[PDB]
Design a protein around this ligand. Structure first.
Ligand SMILES: CC[C@@H](C)[C@@H](NC(=O)[C@@H]1CCCCN1C)C(=O)N(C)[C@H](C[C@@H](OC(C)=O)c1nc(C(=O)N[C@@H](Cc2ccccc2)C[C@@H](C)C(=O)O)cs1)C(C)C
Ligand SMILES: Nc1nc2c(ncn2[C@@H]2O[C@H](COP(=O)(O)OP(=O)(O)OP(=O)(O)O)[C@@H](O)[C@H]2O)c(=O)[nH]1
Ligand SMILES: Nc1nc2c(ncn2[C@@H]2O[C@H](COP(=O)(O)OP(=O)(O)O)[C@@H](O)[C@H]2O)c(=O)[nH]1
Ligand SMILES: [Ca+2]
Ligand SMILES: [Mg+2]
Ligand SMILES: [Mg+2]
Lengths: 67, 440, 427
């Protein structure tokens, strides 16, 4: 009985520790995955816009290439 | 000996917070500068009201409360309002740019910028407590801060406080006062994220409160101020067990034992009585029996649903004021034998009851009559599931076409989070169905 | 606070720009040299949204004025309130674009663009918490349309995460004889569908018809059209400028109004319709702003469905009455509201009435009917471009034909996207 009493409080502690650990883990994966998604979505928006600059030099070059 | 820390989050949480503190001050005889003449221990004590207020050496009684918003204009009113000397400026935290009704901003983009500062101010409050019991969190389901910030906070408090209980008071959205079409999105996301982290949640349906103001207080077009005063009475009835002591008082955690049969099934329905204007209460005591029976009338609920079409799993009654056992016992025995109330077969059919002698108070210039005796009932009914079905359906209508989804994706979310949240809700609705079926 | 930066470009942009500032300055109770002399504190609570602080308690419009014509600059400085704009905030070119989009977007516009950005930066950088930008311009000319959409691309590069709002005036044969407008408009819309968050569609066809047909105006002037445009702009920005719960900033408005990123084109509405020189009830107000005749775009709302709607009522009226009438309106008109977006009409009530009106209503609709406007622009564009007319004006500047095709069909995709959501059901 006394060894069992010890296991029980041990199990309590363990399950509580494990609840915290899992929550920390799930929180951190969600944060970094949200950070990546948001970076990508902004990288792509800016490069689309960069491609507008390439195309606008290309339209002006083509103009001055007319004699 | 057990301190509770209150966290008020976003506009709704904050505005309900002012109403609650104002009202607590009145209840305990604490003036807007924090002084309390009737308190003979200066600088500390372990009186019942000390679960909610700490005390300075100068005799100021300070709320065990943090107010948080991602934008400053609501909290600014608290900084300069009537109660501005009640709180240390460190307990009032604001950012510059709000969540724009977008859970994704409250949880990630904007919220992540302020979450360590908030934890930090919470840790200062926790550190002044000798036997911290837990947290009460006030917030709307619908706003971006109310939803995404609160849920982020709840995740982090689980990690930083493990043991510690967390109770929520959550404003559930109604079309008469809502301000965002995406409120169903925010609500499902925050419920999914918060479900594992909360011990008990009280939903306050803004429609239910709106209607109570129209119908019981003859207010034509109720404002936030009107709803918040009524909501503040319900909250005060529920925290009364911690704030006062008395030979018949039953503590909130004891009610909790009865109200939560399974971790996920932790959403009690509150019903409050009497809500009566001054003119109508003139020449009229409502007896113990009268106010008790009025807890079983759905017009008095604070969520719209019908318990007559479901099953009870618990029923608790929190009486305040001039109330004696003989009368409670008699009023309940009546309801029993008048068989109007059906329990699941796996749950004994009793009624846990508490009584606080302090009578309810009203704020000056309000619409509530001041009465001799009031009662708040907390039940756990399968009918509370109705509120989830109404929201889940609105979610489904929008999400089948991905309406508005691009606003969340643009802030970093994946559709996967939506369907995962909504599956969790489908499961919660199956849960409330399963607990209601008869045993084999 | 949450500041907006205002930018006006080309003749139109500057005309409607100026009126807007005339109107809202009056509303906020400030004189032509920027002194407050109002009687109500609600006039100042959110004044920073649109104005900077000066010394001597002088308020200055956060406004940047641009044209490739130096002329309109002077006619701006001449009007009432011309003396309030920061003088560095005027940025003018040499030629004028002469109704050539490509000049506005690639060549002459480009050369001026950098000096505009400098004033934008100056304004932005000062800003405590900038919400974003509003651009007033026309889509048929060359500056407002071509330089204006270039400016927008350029600002979105430097502030990728602020809100970008236009007031875009759409062209009508009934108002301008230029043959080339369908080109300038199609190429504009191509840019806007990618680079703005929300665009108010002011249709000159609608504004002409209200003035002729409804308002009994004989031969209506630009000043006559602009009277409506300014009433509208006052109405749609009320929520931004006074204290209130609903759509109180640009992002919240976008979030409520834009369910799909490309469907961000609104038809505004107003009631009562008036001209200059001489009260409706809540129910008349309410019925009028859901009526085709009160729309500033030439679309019949009964030819589509609303995805979303905001209504703004101004004046001291009963809130319970507005609530009832608004419910009423949705019940009797339920077919015209997409069923798959619940609670998609929002309602604001502001006590402050406009100028010489006791009570009014402003309507902002994201309706699938707006495809009518695009299809009309589309019919004109394709009448020419098929017979490759006037192309030389544009290619001469370096533009390929392909760019015309792409823009044509991006606007066709758009139309067919509205149709798709008009047709969708709940199962
Ligand atoms: C024959 C050529 C035009 C005179 C005339 N008609 C047309 O253009 C033709 C006629 C029939 C076949 C196709 N349609 C398009 C016209 O009425 N136009 C162009 C007007 C604009 C014109 O009105 C007239 C007839 O004087 C102008 N209005 C103003 C004007 O309003 N100026 C105000 C200041 C101002 C405002 C905005 C722009 C410039 C100047 C000054 C005061 C008087 C005011 O506020 O009303 C300038 S040019 C409207 C369609 C808008
Ligand atoms: N009962 C009550 N409800 C409120 C109050 N203020 C807002 N609400 C409701 O709360 C929801 C709107 O959320 P808010 O709390 O204003 O949003 P927030 O948490 O500040 O989030 P953002 O503004 O998106 O950062 C809507 O359902 C409103 O009807 C209040 O004082 N009392
Ligand atoms: N409502 C209105 N429309 C205008 C005004 N000025 C010009 N327009 C219309 O604007 C278009 C031409 O653009 P404009 O501003 O003159 O060209 P820009 O100066 O190159 O920007 C035509 O469709 C005109 O009929 C105005 O003040 N009010
Ligand atoms: Ca004490
Ligand atoms: Mg807020
Ligand atoms: Mg021009």
């Amino acid at each position: 009985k006394r060894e069992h009493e010890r296991e029980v409080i041990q199990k309590a502690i363990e399950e509580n520790n494990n609840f915290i650990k899992m929550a920390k883990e799930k929180l951190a994966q969600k944060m970094e995955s949200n950070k990546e998604n948001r970076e990508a979505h902004l990288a792509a928006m800016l490069e689309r816009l960069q491609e507008k600059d390439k195309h606008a030099e290309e339209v002006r070059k083509n103009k001055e290439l007319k004699e | 000996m057990r301190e509770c820390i209150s966290i008020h989050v976003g506009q709704a949480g904050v505005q309900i917070g002012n109403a609650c503190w104002e009202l607590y001050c009145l209840e305990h005889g604490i003036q807007p500068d924090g002084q309390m003449p009737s308190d003979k221990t200066i600088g500390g004590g372990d009186d019942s009201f000390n679960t909610f207020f700490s005390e300075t050496g100068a005799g100021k009684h300070v709320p065990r409360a943090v107010f948080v918003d991602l934008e400053p204009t609501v909290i600014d009113e608290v900084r300069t309002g009537t109660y501005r000397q009640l709180f240390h400026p460190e307990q009032l935290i604001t950012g510059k740019e709000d969540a724009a009704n977008n859970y994704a901003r409250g949880h990630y983009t904007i919220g992540k910028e302020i979450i360590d500062l908030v934890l930090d101010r919470i840790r200062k409050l926790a550190d002044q407590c000798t036997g911290l019991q837990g947290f009460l969190v006030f917030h709307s389901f619908g706003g971006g801060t109310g939803s995404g910030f609160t849920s982020l906070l709840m995740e982090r408090l689980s990690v930083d406080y493990g043991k510690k209980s967390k109770l929520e008071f959550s404003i559930y959205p109604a079309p008469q006062v809502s301000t965002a079409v995406v409120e169903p999105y925010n609500s499902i996301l925050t419920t999914h994220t918060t479900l594992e982290h909360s011990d008990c949640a009280f939903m306050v349906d803004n429609e239910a409160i709106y209607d109570i103001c129209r119908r019981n207080l003859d207010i034509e077009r109720p404002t936030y101020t009107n709803l918040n005063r009524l909501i503040s009475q319900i909250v005060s009835s529920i925290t009364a067990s911690l704030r006062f002591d008395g030979a018949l008082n039953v503590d909130l955690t004891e009610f909790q034992t009865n109200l939560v049969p399974y971790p996920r099934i932790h959403f009690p329905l509150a019903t409050y009585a009497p809500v009566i204007s001054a003119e109508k209460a003139y020449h009229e005591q409502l007896s113990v029996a009268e106010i008790t029976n009025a807890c079983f009338e759905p017009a008095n609920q604070m969520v719209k649903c019908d318990p007559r079409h479901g099953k009870y799993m618990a029923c608790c009654l929190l009486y305040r004021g001039d109330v004696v056992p003989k009368d409670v016992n008699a009023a309940i025995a009546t309801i029993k034998t008048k068989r109007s109330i059906q329990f699941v077969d796996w749950c004994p059919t009793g009624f846990k009851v508490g009584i606080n002698y302090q009578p309810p108070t009203v704020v000056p210039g309000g619409d509530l009559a001041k009465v001799q005796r009031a009662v708040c009932m907390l039940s756990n009914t399968t009918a509370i599931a109705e509120a989830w079905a109404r929201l889940d359906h609105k979610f489904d209508l929008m999400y089948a076409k991905r309406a508005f989804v691009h606003w969340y994706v643009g802030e970093g979310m994946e559709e996967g989070e939506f369907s995962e949240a909504r599956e969790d809700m489908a499961a919660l609705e199956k849960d409330y169905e399963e607990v209601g079926v008869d045993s084999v | 606070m949450r500041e907006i930066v205002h930018i006006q470009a080309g003749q139109c942009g500057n005309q409607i720009g100026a009126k807007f500032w005339e109107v809202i300055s009056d509303e906020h109770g400030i004189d032509p040299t920027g002194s407050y002399h109002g009687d109500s504190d609600l006039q100042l609570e959110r004044i920073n949204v649109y104005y900077n602080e000066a010394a001597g308690n002088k308020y200055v419009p956060r406004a940047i004025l641009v044209d490739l014509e130096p002329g309109t600059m002077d006619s701006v400085r001449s009007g009432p309130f011309g003396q309030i704009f920061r003088p560095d905030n005027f940025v003018f070119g040499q030629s004028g674009a002469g109704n050539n989009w490509a000049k506005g977007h690639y060549t002459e516009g480009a050369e001026l663009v950098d000096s505009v950005l400098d004033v934008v930066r100056k304004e932005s950088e000062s800003c405590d918490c900038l919400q974003g930008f509003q651009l007033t311009h026309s889509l048929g000319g060359g500056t407002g349309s071509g330089m204006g959409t270039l400016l927008i691309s350029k600002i979105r590069e430097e502030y990728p995460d602020r809100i970008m709002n236009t007031f875009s005036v759409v062209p009508s044969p009934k108002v301008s004889d230029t043959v080339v407008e369908p080109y300038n408009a199609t190429l504009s819309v191509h840019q806007l569908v990618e680079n703005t968050d929300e665009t108010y569609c002011i249709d000159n066809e609608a504004l002409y018809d209200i003035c002729f047909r409804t308002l009994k105006l004989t031969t209506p002037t630009y000043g006559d059209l602009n009277h409506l445009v300014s009433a509208t702009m006052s109405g749609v920005t009320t929520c931004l400028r006074f204290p209130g719960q609903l759509n109180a900033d640009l992002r919240k408005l976008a979030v409520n109004m834009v369910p799909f990123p490309r469907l961000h084109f609104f038809m505004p509405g107003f009631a009562p319709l008036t001209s200059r020189g001489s009260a409706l009830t809540v129910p008349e107000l309410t019925q009028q702003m859901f009526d085709a005749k009160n729309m500033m775009a030439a679309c019949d709302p009964r030819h589509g469905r609303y995805l979303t709607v905001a209504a703004v009522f101004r004046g001291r009226m009963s809130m319970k009455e507005v609530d009832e009438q608004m419910l009423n309106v949705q019940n009797k008109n339920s077919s015209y509201f997409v069923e798959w977006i619940p609670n998609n009409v929002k309602t604001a009530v502001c006590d402050i009435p406009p100028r010489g009106l006791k009570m009014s209503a402003t309507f902002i609709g994201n309706s699938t009917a707006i495809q009518e406007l695009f299809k009309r622009i589309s019919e004109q564009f394709t009448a020419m471009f098929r017979r490759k007319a006037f192309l030389h004006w544009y290619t001469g500047e370096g533009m390929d034909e392909m760019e015309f095709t792409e823009a044509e069909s991006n606007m066709n995709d758009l139309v067919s996207e509205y149709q798709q959501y008009q047709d969708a059901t709940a199962d």
